[PDB]
Design a protein around this ligand. Structure first.
Ligand SMILES: [Zn+2]
Ligand SMILES: [Zn+2]
Length: 68
């Protein structure tokens, strides 16, 4: 199989984390693609009228509070 990067069709700054646009599970960086479709739907990679985005990312938990 090919388990290598998926060079974001939106940013392409090494798509480290992942946001898979469903039901065509193309993995863009965490919710990068989301931004793209909202303005330009029909997936940048396979012109599908996207439904949801799943973020099966690891070891997260940033910030302290909400503002400070
Ligand atoms: Zn990206
Ligand atoms: Zn797609």
């Amino acid at each position: 199989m090919a388990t290598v990067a998926e060079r974001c069709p939106i940013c392409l700054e090494d798509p480290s984390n992942y946001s898979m646009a469903l039901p065509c599970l193309h993995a863009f960086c965490y919710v990068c693609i989301t931004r793209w479709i909202r303005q330009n739907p029909t997936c940048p990679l396979c012109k599908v009228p996207v439904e949801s985005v799943v973020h099966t990312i690891e070891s997260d938990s940033e910030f302290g509070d909400q503002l400070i």
